[PDB]
Design a binder for these strands. Structure first.
Ligand code: DTP
Ligand SMILES: OC[C@H]1O[C@@](CO)(O[C@H]2O[C@H](CO)[C@@H](O)[C@H](O)[C@H]2O)[C@@H](O)[C@@H]1O
Ligand code: MG
Ligand code: MG
Lengths: 556, 411
DNA sequence: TGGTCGGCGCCCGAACAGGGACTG
DNA sequence: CAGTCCCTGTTCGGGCGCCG
């Protein structure tokens, strides 16, 4: 019985018919070797690591990196080949806690487990596969071979096993202390109570004893008795919280890798700082080859970046969650398919902010995008607070009623009220339900040759108006749109248009206000200028009326 | 200490791996309470991350119930067990159930908890319970008994179920009983009061074997929605153009449709609002057409091998149309739903109600659930559908976006 | 030096699905 | 009656940000 057992372990099979890793170690520089050898020798005395005779035919690389903001070093095993052959787990970490979720607490303690991975036993049968060979200052000295006795860093089963093991240990304490809040994220524990500060510390130490029984050690160095606490990248104060300060690179010449860091920082910032916009900065990253390549900033991404930095200039903060009061989400349209929102309970005291910029579809309008932002906010709220906020939306109640009742898809927004903050969201044009009396009727069609890419778009009308236009480098779809554009160009303020194009009718009936296609944008531009448009569809090649005549013209 | 029937997945198929979606605080609270009792009673037990299989879980309230019901989305598992509950231990379908004047549906799901489950299979019933704001990691469980909503549960329990049923069945030979997953469909031709009473008898009969159900269907009332052509004193060019397009599309279903004489009416290049008198030939062609649409399609018959497909269209003003079929244009049923819950205020609640009603009819008529083509955006449906779901099963669906060129189904 | 693991978020582009219209 | 080509929309894996 050379090694003792501390806490219940987790059976871990290999993927069937596969065997443990063998691969030679890295040419590690001696400077790193000094740090590694000292820590690794220490492990055996605890019982975390064990020596192995060459009976263990497994080799896996090893390396190390310094713990940030510390002199200590982190011991990390490149188990990429062992992961590949290790059984799959089901991750139990379903997301990240947000401070806006937290309720106000009288006393808050943040404590960190020490050597958390190294305090959890690895599976006994599985221990053999860990094996790695240590290196020396020269290549003369061989170095000892070691197998882990506990969870190691760089494996693919370590986080889930630790989180599940940690939860099992915590569960008895939380059952004895129903009124303590413990946010458990990896080894970081957030403990909050309404107990008075002296009584709270009694529970905190008592919890430390409970964790001690299972070999989990909470050092004083990471203990956080006094606010403001540092937790999950946030600064926690008794009544407010904020993100830990974010440094944005100042570079005069920007590479591709540069913009990525910038963008990713601004997304982290946008959870509290209102109105962050990344649209034009991300425009610089589309269709680029080298991560190293240098790229100049347009005057759009530059102007954007300027006001983005200025938003960060002033400190902002969020508040905590009061289950007694309602949740409220307000959304503003920011232009170019950009939307920002604020979630709050008391006016002007925000829980959090955010943005929805995703461009979805080749053709869309503001009402669809507003509906998308509402859904993203609703799901986000359910994660953080488990309920849907009341919505304040910059869209008239009648606009929304007109859209959803007439649309052919099921669509819905939860309980909401109108806020009169411009720019308001509206439908730019409305198609008539019935044909317009006394308006000219344009029968439109277009065709194109698959091989030549040549085509014609034209119309015929009841008054005798006619047009045919030749087109180059086109498609059948594009000429059917073109035909409609021609009828709109050449008509008065009220017009009936008859097409046989299902493609075109589907785009236009969804009332788009923006399109990737310039041709659709021009069609939109014309639709907005009309007083009345009636679009109707007939089947092609049925000998119908004007449709037959215009079909002959464009086919030629 | 009961024998456990062994179960296996379809060959070459691994277990379900489906992420748990976010849950509202009320549902999480209900699930934690339900699972605590189920663990105490040994129905489920906690499991580690070494199990690599997960199935989504959430809670529902059945119509008027007010009491939370745990519901597991086993669709992925059921697809990987499929051969088991069809090929081997399955149930035959009583063609007479749709003919009964009244059919009551009972939730016998609790019975399944009695029987235990094959130890080798329990790894596949894993489900994770989420926490608000991710305070805790996910609390994983697995099933030690026959789970509600799995398709092996009614098959494994069918031996036990028939013996419990058999005294009741002999006492009333006429009454018809069908079992689909957690549900028992009880169809009698009796008068209302006698029917309800016999259900109480079958309730007690279930009670002395170790649950109250009040959902009543009347499949004989169920009717269909014929394709209909408008009646007009006068016809404009637009009206005839709409009619020709509708008739031409309809001719993919009824091959006897003819548009020639109606097409003749639109030979020129005419203004849409111009009134067009009908000729005798068109009046007769239109008459013959309306008659044909009353008739059935030739050679439409259900095929047990093939899957059912359901299509739904939003017609506006609280009205919905659906078609059930297996082959394109060979429709086994077509219908309309109006004035459902959420009418004129919530499309998703109405679409949800529609999906449920259509699935119920398919279970009664054919003992299957169709795969739905849903007229909604994937993100809109997934955000809200669980909020309005009141059934213990969950059909398969996909999402479609068809703008409607012509209103064939509605008028 | 360059190098590990899991989670979540964004934005990207490529690879893939599928529905119509037209070509033989 | 297949087989393409358009065109659209989805999915998935890549990079970055953030947390252990
Ligand atoms: N860069 C990383 N690579 C792999 N695993 C990591 C990494 N960073 C953290 N982890 C994992 C392993 C750790 O056991 C666990 C917690 O990390 P952390 O608390 O910061 O240090 P630690 O608990 O190992 O030592 P200590 O608490 O004394 O600082 O999360
Ligand atoms: O809605 C699609 C979405 O649902 C998931 C899980 O909820 O898949 C489920 O629904 C599918 C369509 O009915 C089924 O085929 C599948 O088996 C079932 O798990 C997700 O996989 C998917 O993103
Ligand atoms: Mg630690
Ligand atoms: Mg044509």
């Amino acid at each position: 019985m050379v090694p003792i057992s501390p806490i219940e372990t987790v059976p871990v099979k290999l993927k069937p018919g596969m065997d443990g890793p063998k691969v030679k170690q890295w040419p590690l520089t001696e400077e790193k070797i000094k740090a590694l050898v000292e820590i690794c020798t220490e492990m055996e005395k605890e019982g975390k690591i064990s020596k192995i005779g060459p009976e263990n035919p497994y080799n896996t690389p090893v390396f190390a990196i310094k713990k940030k903001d510390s002199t200590k070093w982190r011991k990390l095993v490149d188990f990429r080949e062992l992961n590949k052959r290790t059984q799959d787990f089901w991750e139990v970490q379903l997301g990240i806690p947000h401070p806006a979720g937290l309720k106000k607490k009288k006393s808050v303690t943040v404590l960190d487990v020490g050597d958390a991975y190294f305090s959890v036993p690895l599976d006994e049968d599985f221990r053999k596969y860990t094996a790695f060979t240590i290196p020396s200052i020269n290549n003369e000295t061989p170095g000892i071979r070691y197998q882990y006795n506990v969870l190691p860093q760089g494996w693919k089963g370590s986080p889930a096993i630790f989180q599940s093991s940690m939860t099992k240990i915590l569960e008895p304490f939380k059952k004895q202390n129903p009124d303590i809040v413990i946010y458990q994220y990896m080894d970081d524990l957030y403990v909050g109570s309404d107990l008075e500060i002296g009584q709270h510390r009694t529970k905190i130490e008592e919890l430390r004893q409970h964790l001690l029984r299972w070999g989990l050690t909470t050092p004083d160095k990471k203990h956080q008795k006094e606010p403001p606490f540092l937790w999950m990248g946030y600064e926690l104060h008794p009544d407010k919280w904020t993100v830990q300060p974010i440094v944005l690179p100042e570079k005069d010449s920007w590479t591709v890798n540069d913009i990525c860091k910038l963008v990713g920082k601004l997304n982290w910032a946008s959870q509290i700082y209102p109105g962050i916009k990344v649209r034009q900065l991300s425009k610089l990253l589309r269709g680029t080859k080298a991560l190293t390549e240098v790229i100049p900033l347009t005057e759009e991404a530059e102007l954007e970046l300027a006001e983005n930095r200025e938003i960060l200039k002033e400190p902002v903060h969020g508040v905590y969650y009061d289950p007694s009061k309602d949740l409220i989400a307000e959304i503003q349209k920011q232009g170019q398919g950009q939307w920002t929102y604020q979630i709050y309970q008391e006016p002007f005291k925000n829980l959090k902010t955010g943005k929805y910029a995703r461009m979805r579809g080749a053709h869309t309008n503001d009402v669809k995008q507003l509906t998308e932002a509402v859904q993203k906010i609703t799901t986000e709220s359910i994660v953080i607070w488990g309920k849907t906020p009341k919505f304040k939306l910059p869209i008239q109640k009648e606009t929304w009623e007109t859209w959803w009742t007439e649309y052919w898809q099921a669509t819905w927004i939860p309980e909401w009220e109108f806020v009169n903050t411009p720019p308001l969201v509206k439908l730019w044009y409305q198609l008539e339900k019935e044909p317009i009396v006394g308006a000219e009727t344009f029968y439109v069609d277009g065709a194109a040759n698959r091989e030549t890419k040549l085509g014609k778009a034209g119309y015929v009308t009841n008054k005798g108006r006619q047009k045919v236009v030749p087109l180059t480098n086109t498609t059948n779809q594009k000429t059917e749109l073109q035909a409609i554009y021609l009828a709109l160009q050449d008509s008065g303020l009220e017009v009936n248009i008859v097409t046989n194009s299902q493609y075109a009718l589907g785009i236009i009936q969804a009332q788009p206000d923006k399109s990737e296609s310039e041709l659709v944008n021009q069609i939109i531009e014309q639709l907005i200028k009309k007083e009345k448009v009636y679009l109707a569809w007939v089947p092609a090649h049925k000998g119908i009326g004007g449709n037959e005549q215009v079909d002959k013209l464009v086919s030629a | 200490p009961i024998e456990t029937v062994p179960v296996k997945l379809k060959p070459g198929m691994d277990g379900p791996k489906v992420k748990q979606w976010p849950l509202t605080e009320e549902k999480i609270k209900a699930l934690v309470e339900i699972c605590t009792e189920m663990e105490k009673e040994g129905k489920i037990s906690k499991i580690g991350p070494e199990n690599p299989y997960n199935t989504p879980v959430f809670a529902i309230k059945k119509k008027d119930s007010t009491k939370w019901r745990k519901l597991v989305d086993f669709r992925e598992l059921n697809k990987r067990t499929q051969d088991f509950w069809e090929v081997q231990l399955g149930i035959p379908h009583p063609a007479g159930l749709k003919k009964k004047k009244s059919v009551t549906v009972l939730d016998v799901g609790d019975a399944y908890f009695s029987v235990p489950l094959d130890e080798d299979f329990r790894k596949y019933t894993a489900f994770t319970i989420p926490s608000i704001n991710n305070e805790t990691p996910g609390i994983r469980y697995q099933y030690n008994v026959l789970p509600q909503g799995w398709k092996g549960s009614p098959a494994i329990f069918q031996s036990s179920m028939t013996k419990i049923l058999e005294p009741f069945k002999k006492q009333n030979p006429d009454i018809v009983i069908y079992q689909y997953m957690d549900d028992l469909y009880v169809g009698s031709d009796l008068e209302i009061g006698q029917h309800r009473t016999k259900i109480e008898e079958l309730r007690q009969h279930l009670l002395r074997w170790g649950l109250w159900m009040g959902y009543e269907l009347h499949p004989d009332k169920w009717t269909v929605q014929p394709i209909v052509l408008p009646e007009k004193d006068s016809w404009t060019v637009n009206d005839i153009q709409k009619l020709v397009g509708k008739l031409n599309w309809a001719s993919q279903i009824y091959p006897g449709i003819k548009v020639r004489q109606l097409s003749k009416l639109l030979r020129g290049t005419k203004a849409l609002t111009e009134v067009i008198p009908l000729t005798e030939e068109a009046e007769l062609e239109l008459a013959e057409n309306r008659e044909i649409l009353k008739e059935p399609v030739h050679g439409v018959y259900y095929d047990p091998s093939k899957d059912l497909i359901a299509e739904i269209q939003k017609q506006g003003q609280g009205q919905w149309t659906y078609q059930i079929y297996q082959e394109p244009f060979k429709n086994l049923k077509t219908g309309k739903y109006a004035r459902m819950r959420g009418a004129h205020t919530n499309d998703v609640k109405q679409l949800t109600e529609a999906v449920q009603k259509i699935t119920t009819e398919s279970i009664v008529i054919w003992g299957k659930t169709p795969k739905f083509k849903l007229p909604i955006q994937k993100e809109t449906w997934e955000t809200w559908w669980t909020e309005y779901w009141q059934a213990t099963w969950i059909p398969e669906w996909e999402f479609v976006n068809t703008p409607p060129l012509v209103k064939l189904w509605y008028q």
